[model samples]
Target chain A: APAEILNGKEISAQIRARLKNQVTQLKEQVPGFTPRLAILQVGNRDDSNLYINVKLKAAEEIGIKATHIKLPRTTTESEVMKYITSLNEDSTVHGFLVQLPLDSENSINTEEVINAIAPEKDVDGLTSINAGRLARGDLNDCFIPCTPKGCLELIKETGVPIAGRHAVVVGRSKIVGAPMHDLLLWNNATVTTCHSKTAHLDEEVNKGDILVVATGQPEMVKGEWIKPGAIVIDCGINYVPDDKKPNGRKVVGDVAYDEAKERASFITPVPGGVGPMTVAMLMQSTVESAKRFLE
Target chain B: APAEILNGKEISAQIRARLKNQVTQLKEQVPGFTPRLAILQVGNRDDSNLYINVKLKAAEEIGIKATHIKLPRTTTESEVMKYITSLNEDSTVHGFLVQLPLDSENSINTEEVINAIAPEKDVDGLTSINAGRLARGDLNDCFIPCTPKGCLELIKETGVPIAGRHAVVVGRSKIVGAPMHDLLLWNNATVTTCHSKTAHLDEEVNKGDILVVATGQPEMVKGEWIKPGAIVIDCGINYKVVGDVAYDEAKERASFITPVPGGVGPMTVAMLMQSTVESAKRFLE
Candidate 1:
């Protein structure tokens, strides 16, 4: 039997629609209220601008006021701090998303800067407090990183029970694989985390009843490597050259999708899969922060 | 071949002696300086008393000043909070060990109470911050939970490199199994965490190159389940019986096995002393 393609594009749309409704309700229930998200971008990198454009469009569609605070590439770490503190204290702003890489000319310690955002206002959930809370299985108290959170929602949509299942995460990255393991573990799934250091990657990968691959190695996991009837959630996004397209580049995931697609009980394709859900989850976090601000 | 008994008594004594030397050096270098550990027990359960007594003697042996602050069973969580705050503020106390089972008659939120310990002085490493740091593989920045710490030390004694080995942890208790996985993962060992929810315990146990069991069910892991020549560390101390692994049978199967009472038990206290001394040395620095 051919596996069902887990439609993350559709899932992402439904979640955003619900959030849009929630945003509309909050504005009506509270007079003169707006769900505001302050995105602090340190530099004017083209890629940064491109990503912010997407977030801005998503926010506007969801009836959110997304303010993009662009700072110069030469901005010092202290200048970035001032921006963070202001948003942390700003009553109008309910959520914060600090664009990654800082892209600053100066030495901006990313760890210190991320942790500086108040846990309550940290919509991106990259702060240490949020990570700590999530690690301890206090899922309700902490905002999980958007990418992993979205990957989980897609897994749940598969209708397979998480408890008593064996889930294998193919990376130990703090952003995705690590937290995903903790999340699955707390949900009562027996999880084995395999990494570059793992001796037998194929044997380990094949054992997963629910397989999540985030390794950037494109198409590293062949269809034969995937366990039959396993749910595959590939979070990897790697671009490879393909003459078939005008751009001569195509986006692919860590798993060999064409082959794995047949074996997997459910699978998420690269571009339309985990990617769109990330933006949706980020917006959802913003809406949640706004809801909490009303309280 | 009979499995070699991994003697915790000898390993712990060796560890304690090294700590005694360090503590002695700290006192001599910084005149009148003493490493202090504050043990705050909410209520005096007999078991708690026994544990505290062992710690006191161990501390004295290592030249550490371990203070036993015993609160009444009737004490409330707020009252306990006050005690924690005082210790947290007290520069004299370099280490903090809040005895388990808080044992207070009033509702004492254990999570809140445990997190109250300053991360630096939290020798037990039960705080969320420490747990998070450990989870992220920051071994130097955090004090590891002692039982797991002891288990790791015993595993190291086997002379097998942790990196690239497959470790199976049976149980996910915050104090033992969960942190044990984190420690092993950071050390670069591929780890599979199993719990009550694991579908196949025997299969998982059989696959482990390094197996550490802390399941409360005494003798849950059978001898036949153990991988041939596997290094097994049993961290369970079940009520009125043996460890989580069937020791007598497992002894023959395992290349190195920890005896229930004399194994991970003594090393746990040893790691506690070691962690306390580590905290003190950091404070001095």
Candidate 2:
């Protein structure tokens, strides 16, 4: 039997169309209203560049204003904060984000940079205030981190019942696993967060009726470990060597997609699932921040 | 064979003695340094009154100044906020808390009042900032909610290794179960949080090497459900004719268990005092 694919590309398009209409309506209603997103990239890491380009392209597709402020690899922590502060004060820039994995060799201090983002303009939702607000279940005031937000949206699109199900989140990173834990709990799922220290991994993984795999390790969750008819969301994006491919590499998720799909009632494909949704949610948050300015 | 009773009374006394010495040391060093705790009570629920009295008495014993500000049932939210704002600004009042379950009949917003408390003086740790900070594993800047903090302290005193142990919490209240989950997780425990919607309650209970039961339901976790050689901390303090847990049956199976009356109740007030001291230390700095 063929498994149901929770297609992120399709859902993200739907979201972007809705956002495009919303942006159109807002521009009509409020004079000089332009939903804007500012991207601050500290170092030119290939992955960060790819993510930023995707965001910029998505911003264009949704008719939102986009600005890219690229910095040298030698940019200091204070220099990055100066840009964040300027963007925060700029009424034109509704929301903005500093790219992750800032140059550690130059002492960029990612946490400090994240904290510098104004909560209202924190489209990335990495600020401690926003992170704290999300953890406390105070959703009205802050933005949710994009990846987990996208995962939840994907799960909802599957129409799988969230309440009373066992949700096992693999990984405890602040951006995804931790927020995912809170979101599942908020939705009334009996939630358990498994990290590197987790004992009996297969036993715990099998218990999950709704499983979210975010660990960057490629294909860590084998197909046999997935419960029958469960909903699986794989947030990991990793590159593995593949001689057959012209690029000599293939992108994969934390879950062994081929085998896991057979058991999973609905599963997200690695490339087309969770990836596009991340950019879409960022646009949604930027649009949300812009609307709040009018309010 | 009877289970080893995790005595809160004895442990609380140890904490108080340590606090007393610390209070004395601070008083001697700083000129006119008196750690003061202001307790704000509105409508006067019997349970709230009893809790307030216990805290007041404990403050005296520990040589900390205690002030109880009693407001009428008809007091408006703004009136309560006025008191909180005054206290927050008052440098002498180092730490304070507005008692929980405020007069809802009078349309008093409990969350609004909790937010009005300065994070530095949020002795109860009910504010969103403190709660959020604690959840994010930022422990240096906030006071932990008393009940969960006391539970962790008790668990630590038992010499049971928390890291890598499966710690199952059986409730999801913001004050107890939610904070308990974060505390255990922060301590490197493989933590699972179960609430009203949980399926396979017994299966989850049996998985816990360390179990924390905070559900107010009386005797919900029976003797049969407990894992043998497991350390159980019962946070429920229900008094239904007698105590909540079936003591005779439960004590026999578990390696260590907290008695309902003397266990978590004393620990809450003791931890409240400890929280006051923690807030006072911040003031000293």
Candidate 3:
């Protein structure tokens, strides 16, 4: 039997439409209600460019305005802070995003930049204060991060209630993996995150009720690594060779999609699964940012 | 064959005298260099008053200027906040202490008041931010609470190297047991905290190279509970006809003793003694 495919495009469309309705409601409530986001990209990393493009496209589809600010490879930490501070003061900009990896060599002070963001307008939930709040389950002041929020939405769409389920997240990146662990924990799912140093990876994978792979490895996770009937969310997108495919090669996720799909209960495809939902979440956050502060 | 005693009073006096010398040096370097501590007592709880009095006496002995701020039993949350905010702005008041259990009423906001205190002046280290800092092992921004700090000092004063030692703390309170566990961890000791819910208390106690009991139950830790050559610091100060540890039998197996009244009690005051000097040290900033 084939696994059920969790369509990210369809899920994202539903969420974006809901956000559009929210924007309309917010406009009626606050005259001249405009949700704006500023995306700061330092240098021209191809992956960063692709992500920024998605954020803009998502904003356009959801009736929110997004402006991308590009910087040279030599952008100083202070320069980034200055732009973020300006965006913070701008009433038009409800929320903002600072694309990282200023350069492979120059270390941008990411913590200072994230800390400078006003907690009220910190839609991404990446600030240290927000991190602490989320860790302690203080829902009163938490804004769920975009990728994790989308991951939960994907699981919720499956109708396979996640409560009491053992969900294994195979990464611990601050953006996706750690926050995903917290979100799953908030819903009473026992979550254990595996990283490069995690011993006996296959043993851990075999115990999962839900498995999320975000290791950025191309087809690193195999079918035998998956637990039977486990819902898998593949968060990795890496380019792999395929002469017949478009651009002489195509994008694939960490999981061996075809092989795992056979044993898994439900799976999200690489490009179309979690990708669009991430943008949808950004749009939803913008609308929420406006509604919370403006209305 | 007698167990060694972990003498809290003797070690505490050493720490107090050292603190006094440091205070004297600072005063000599700059005239009128006394550390000022404003202790705020919400109500006239007998236990709270007694604790504050001991702290006051310790502060004065160490050349620290101590002031008592007594508020009515019915003080509102806003009133407490106003007092803390004033202390935060005042340059003269270096550090301050707020006696806990201000009001048993549900209306009092303890977390908010603790958060409002200047981190530099948070000598108690009770705030969650400070707690997180301590957990992260960043002593630069936070202070370990008095009781646990005293426990560490007592252990160090024994002249026994604690590296690779197994320390089992017999409680998990944020104030003493938990922070004491972290201190043991920081000192390169394998540490475990045993609480009421701990599955095997006796088994854990037997595995300890260092055993510190902070639960206020009198004589709960029997002499048989002591591991041979284990350095025990009894943090509980309950008054009874007998103490928490079966003193006679414990002395046979244990290497140290912190007697109930004379042991950790005086160390508590000694910590207040050092905090006063610390308050003065940071006051110049």
Candidate 4:
């Protein structure tokens, strides 16, 4: 039997359309209900530019008033912090994203930047306080992380009850893997986190009803490591040799796709799986950030 | 041969004396250096009064000024919050404790009260932020829960190195069992925590190089459940005709013991012993 593909493009489009209606309804219900978002771009990293553009395009499509602020590569730390502080105090700016890439040459402190954002406007929810709240399983207050929040949506889309399920999240990085483990446990799945230091990683990976692979290492998660018919969401975007392409490189998810597709009941293909959903969720969060603060 | 006892009374006295000298030094160093602590007692429960008096005695012995603020049973939440807010703004009050008994029905929110205390002066470290820091093994920041902190000190006093040791904690409460597990793990001990729902509780208890029983179940931990010569810190202060651990059975198997009343009971007051001096030091600063 052929495996089912979780098409993120279709799903994201559906989500964006729903958000557009919400924006319309919000404007009608409230006088002068124009939600505003600010996008702060620090440097000229190509991928960062691309990501910011996606978010801005989505925000515009949903009728959210948005502004793009570009800073040079030589922007000082205090300059960035100064802009963020002004934005935090400004009632006009509802949601903001400080687009930063993890490349070493950039030399911008991402942790400090995220900390500088007000917890309420921290739509990205990457602040240490939010992370602590999420880690402690305090549902009363917490802005859940984006990628993990997207992953939970994908799981709910499968219609499989997550309770009592064994979920093994590979990789323990703060953004994707660690937060994903916490989310899965909150949904009542017994979770074990495996990282670079984990021994017998294959054994741990095999013991899961749901397997989420976020490690950036290409082809690191073997098809055999997946339990039969397990739900797999590959969060890695890796570049590998493909002589057929103009650049002799192609993008792939972390899973051995053909083999994993046969073994797993549901799978998300790399470029289309979590990537599109991430952008879609970012858009939704902007709308949410605006509604929560502005409208 | 009978087992040696873990003498918390003698240890607590030594700690108190050390605090006394520190207090003297603080008084000499700072002008008008009096370590002042305010105990806010609500409803006047017998146990609460007893605990407050014990702290008051400890404070006086160490040359620290202590006062108890007694409120009626009908005290409003705002009344307590206002008092705590005033203390937070005051430069004089060094540290304070708002006691919560096992079964007290009052409007006092413990977490809110902890939050009201200045974090620097929160010597008890029950604030969620402090508790979270402790959970993450960031001990350098502040003091942790007094009971668990005392439990570790008592275990270390036995001259036992906890690193790479199998430590079993038999309860899962936040104050004693959970915090103690984190502390043991921070000390490099492989830890397993057993609660009421844990399957085959005895099997879990038997696999420990060090066992801490805080379940308050009288004689629930038997002789056979203990590994020979394993150090046990009995955190349960239950008043039973017998005892929490079948001491006769445990005595034959264990090499070290903490008797019921004289064990961890005295160590509970030892926080004020040293913290009063801490209060004085902070006041001097």
Q: Highest DockQ among the candidates is held by which one?
A: 1
TM-score of chain A of each: 0.97, 0.93, 0.90, 0.93
Per-residue lDDT of candidate 4, residues A153-192 (tens digit): 7877888888767677887566787668667756666554
lDDT, residue A33, model 3: 71
B39-123 per-residue lDDT for model 3 (tens digits) = 8878788989888888887888777888899988778889889999998898888888788878544378776777688767777
Clashing pairs in 1: none
**TM-score (C-alpha, index-matched) for candidate 2:** 0.91
Candidate 2 structure lDDT: 0.86
- Scored by CA lDDT, what does every candidate get? 0.90, 0.86, 0.76, 0.74
Q: Give me the TM-scores of chain B across the candidates.
A: 0.98, 0.96, 0.93, 0.93
- Fnat of every candidate, listed in order: 0.66, 0.48, 0.00, 0.01
Q: Give the per-residue lDDT of model 1 (tens digit) for A14-109.
A: 999999999898889897998999899998889989999999999999999999999999999999999999999999999987998789889998
> Could you give the candidate ranking by DockQ, starting with the highest?
1, 2, 4, 3
For all predicted structures, in order, the TM-scores are: 0.96, 0.91, 0.66, 0.71
Over B1-285, each residue of candidate 2 has an lDDT whose tens digit, in order, gives 878988988888888888999899888889588899999989879989988899999999998999999898989999999999999999999899998878545898687888889988999888876876777777877788899988998898789889888888999887898989989988988888998899888888888888899888888887777788888898887764223346677788888888877787778888889889878888778
Q: Clashing pairs in model 2?
A: none
DockQ of each: 0.71, 0.55, 0.09, 0.15
Chain A TM-score, prediction 2: 0.93
In TM-score terms, candidate 1 sits at: 0.96
